[PDB]
C-alpha cells in the first residue's frame, strides 16, 4: 500500500467576497439601504477608503456555504488507498462527531476574526448570523464580539446551537447556508481597511471589498496544538503549519507532527495519533488542497 500519486480535496466552508457599507449606529436594524464605501485616490499616489463624515459604523456582509462529505477526494489513482482512507475517516466520524471543529468554527464566527484590522480599536462590534432555507430566515443569532474572547474558547448555549448547525452541515445531514453581517463603531470619517491588490485596493462594482480567501483564512484558525508554544494563540491550519507574517514555520517535518507524516502514519500503518492531532488532520481535510506527489 503505497500512497496515491495524485490526491486532491475540494474545499468545504466556502465563503464569498465581503462587502463594506457605512452608516450610523442605532440606525442599525434598518441596515439595508446603506451606501457603499468607495475607494478613491489621494497624493506618490495611493488609494484610500474612508467612511463618510456623518457615519461611524462599518457594515461587512458575506455568505457561507457548508458543503459536507469531507472524506471523499476528487482525484485519486489507487482504489485500495481510497477505500482505506474512507474507512479511516468514517472510523473517525463514528468514534466522535464534528462537534469540536464546529465549536471552534462557531467561535471564529462568533467574534470578528474576519474583521482583520477593522476590529482593532473599536467601541462595539456586533455580529448577526442568519440561517436560510428558502426565501426566508429559519433562525437568527445576535452576538457580541468584544465579550467573546479572542484566545479563550469558552462554551455557551447559542454557540452550542450554531455548532450543532455547522456540525450537522459538515456531516452531510442537510444543506447549510449562512448569512453573516458584522457591525463596528470606528468613528466619524475614519479609515477602513479593504484588501490590497498586486497601492491599489480590491473592489467590486463601486464598493470596497475583502477577498474570499482572507475570510477563509480567518475562519480556520483552529490550531492550538503547536509543539513549540501554546501561549501565543491559535494560528490557522496549514500543512507545515506556517505563518507568513511572522516568517516562521511551526510544525516542522523534522518532528513527527506534520500533516503528511501523520496522514501517512495513520492511513497506511494504522498508527493512530493523539486525539487533538486527529482533529488537526481532519481540519486539513476540510481545508482541502493538492496532496500527493
Amino acid at each position: 500500500l503505497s500512497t496515491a500519486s495524485v490526491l486532491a480535496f475540494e474545499r468545504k466552508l466556502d465563503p464569498s467576497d465581503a462587502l463594506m457599507s457605512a452608516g450610523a449606529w442605532a440606525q442599525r436594524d434598518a441596515s439595508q439601504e446603506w451606501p457603499a464605501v468607495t475607494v478613491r485616490e489621494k497624493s506618490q499616489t495611493v488609494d484610500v477608503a474612508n467612511l463618510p463624515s456623518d457615519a461611524d459604523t462599518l457594515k461587512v456582509r458575506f455568505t457561507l456555504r457548508v458543503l459536507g462529505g469531507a472524506g471523499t477526494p476528487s482525484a485519486c489513482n489507487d482504489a485500495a488507498y481510497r477505500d482505506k482512507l474512507l474507512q479511516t475517516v468514517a472510523t473517525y466520524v463514528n468514534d466522535q462527531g464534528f462537534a469540536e471543529l464546529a465549536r471552534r468554527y462557531a467561535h471564529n464566527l462568533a467574534n470578528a476574526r474576519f474583521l482583520w484590522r477593522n476590529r482593532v480599536g473599536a467601541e462595539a462590534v456586533e455580529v448577526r448570523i442568519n440561517h436560510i432555507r428558502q426565501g426566508e430566515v429559519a433562525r437568527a443569532w445576535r452576538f457580541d464580539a468584544l465579550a467573546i474572547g479572542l484566545r479563550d474558547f469558552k462554551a455557551d448555549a447559542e454557540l452550542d446551537a450554531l455548532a450543532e448547525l455547522i456540525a450537522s452541515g459538515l456531516s452531510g445531514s442537510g444543506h447549510v447556508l449562512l448569512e453573516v453581517v458584522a457591525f463596528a463603531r470606528i468613528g466619524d470619517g475614519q479609515e477602513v481597511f479593504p484588501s490590497q491588490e498586486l497601492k491599489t485596493l480590491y473592489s467590486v462594482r463601486d464598493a470596497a471589498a475583502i477577498h474570499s480567501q482572507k475570510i477563509g483564512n480567518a475562519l480556520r484558525t483552529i490550531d492550538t496544538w503547536y509543539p513549540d508554544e501554546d501561549g501565543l494563540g491559535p494560528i490557522a491550519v496549514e500543512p507545515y503549519g506556517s505563518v507568513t507574517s511572522q516568517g516562521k514555520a511551526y510544525r516542522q517535518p523534522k518532528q513527527k507532527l506534520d500533516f503528511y507524516t501523520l496522514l501517512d502514519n495513520w492511513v497506511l500503518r494504522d498508527e493512530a495519533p493523539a486525539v487533538e492531532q486527529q482533529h488537526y488532520v481532519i481540519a486539513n481535510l476540510i481545508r482541502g488542497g493538492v496532496f500527493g506527489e
Binding site: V48, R113, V120, G121, T221, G233, Q246
Partner: protein, 189 residues
C-alpha cells in the same frame, strides 16, 4: 527619585499582525491615551530598544504616579488590547534607579519639503534650487522607528525619536506629549 509607581505592558503574539503593527497601534493608543487623557508626570519606557537592530521594544514599562497609574488600569478605552496583549499590576521601584533617556525628537532628513517652502519663499529654480541644496544635507536616522502607516500616506513609513544618555543621578522633570523625556530623565531597569 520619587515616582516609584510602574505600569507594565507585556506584549503577546498574534497571528494577524507582527509586533511592529501592535507597536504602531499602541503608539496611537499612547498619543491618544496620554495626549487625549491628561497628566504631565506620566512617562513610558521601552526596555527592548536596540539601535543596532532597529527595534522598538519587547515589553512596555510605564512610569506614573500613584493615582496616575491607579486610575488607568480600569480603562474601557484600554480594551481591545486586553484580548491582543497582556497586562500586570502595580509594583514598587528600587532605590537606585539609573537615569536613562527616552523621548521623541524629529529629524529633518529631506530637503524637498524645505525646497517646496524654499520654492514658495526663496523663488529657486530647477538648477539653482537643486544646486543651492547639496546632497549631504539629507540623512536617514537609523534609530528605533515605528511604521505609523496612518491616513496621510498610504504606504508604510518610518518613525523618528531621539533618546538620551545613561546616568546614575536622578533628575526628574515634566513629561512630553507622548510620555517621554524633554529635559527630564527617566529610570531604566
Amino acid at each position: 527619585f520619587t515616582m516609584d509607581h510602574y505600569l507594565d505592558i507585556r506584549l503577546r503574539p498574534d497571528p494577524e499582525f507582527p509586533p511592529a503593527q501592535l507597536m504602531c497601534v499602541l503608539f496611537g493608543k499612547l498619543h491618544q491615551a496620554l495626549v487625549a487623557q491628561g497628566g504631565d508626570r506620566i512617562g513610558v519606557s521601552f526596555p527592548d530598544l536596540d539601535e543596532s537592530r532597529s527595534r522598538l521594544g519587547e515589553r512596555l514599562r510605564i512610569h506614573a504616579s500613584a493615582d496616575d497609574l491607579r486610575a488607568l488600569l480600569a480603562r474601557p478605552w484600554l480594551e481591545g488590547l486586553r484580548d491582543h496583549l497582556q497586562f500586570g499590576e502595580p509594583a514598587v521601584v528600587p532605590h537606585p534607579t539609573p537615569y536613562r533617556q527616552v523621548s521623541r525628537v524629529q529629524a529633518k532628513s529631506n530637503p524637498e519639503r524645505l525646497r517646496r517652502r524654499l520654492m514658495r519663499r526663496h523663488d529657486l529654480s530647477e538648477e539653482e534650487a537643486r544646486k543651492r541644496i547639496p546632497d549631504t544635507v539629507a540623512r536617514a536616522l537609523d534609530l528605533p522607528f515605528v511604521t505609523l502607516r496612518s491616513q496621510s500616506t498610504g504606504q508604510h513609513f518610518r518613525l523618528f525619536i531621539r533618546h538620551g544618555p545613561l546616568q546614575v543621578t536622578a533628575e526628574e522633570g515634566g513629561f512630553t506629549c507622548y510620555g517621554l523625556s524633554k529635559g527630564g530623565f527617566v529610570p531604566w531597569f
